Amino acid sequence: PPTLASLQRLLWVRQAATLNHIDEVWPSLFLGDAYAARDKSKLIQLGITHVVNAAAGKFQVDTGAKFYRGMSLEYYGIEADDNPFFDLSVYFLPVARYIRAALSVPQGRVLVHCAMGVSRSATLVLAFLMIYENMTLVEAIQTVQAHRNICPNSGFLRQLQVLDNRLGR
């Protein structure tokens, strides 16, 4: 049973010098930023079939279904703030399920992005791994963090612990 400090330490202890716009963090599963989000072309390259906008909203990364018009891809918008007091966890299961049914598609290649792809979307990716890849939070992080610097905020971490916990039992 880890403490917060241990996770944050971990989140610190393993971080490369730079951060890219997108990153395959798991087979057919990408963590990206809003730049990569609107990078229609690389999207094409990568063969993304599903975009998870965890920074969705007119007041945030307002890409929506319309931005991808003509493009052969499906969209999920989650109107979340990167605030410790924002309950991302209410999105934890449904998104795990969304991402799951996608990757279950042969072509299934999912992008999960927020603004900078390190916290809000990072977190939703974590939960998915714990929930559907049989991982734990630390394992999730070590796995994910092998390809992309991440750092869910304290409250998102606290959110994950709880999830780790429900799953422990």
From Swiss-Prot:
Highly expressed in the testis (at protein level). Also found in the skeletal muscle. One of its GO terms (cellular component) is cytoplasm. Residues 21-169 form the Tyrosine-protein phosphatase domain. It catalyses: O-phospho-L-tyrosyl-[protein] + H2O = L-tyrosyl-[protein] + phosphate; O-phospho-L-seryl-[protein] + H2O = L-seryl-[protein] + phosphate; O-phospho-L-threonyl-[protein] + H2O = L-threonyl-[protein] + phosphate. It comes from the Eukaryota. SUPFAM superfamilies: (Phosphotyrosine protein) phosphatases II (SSF52799). The active site is at C114. This is Dual specificity protein phosphatase 13B. It comes from Homo sapiens (Human). The lineage of its organism: Eukaryota, Metazoa, Chordata, Craniata, Vertebrata.
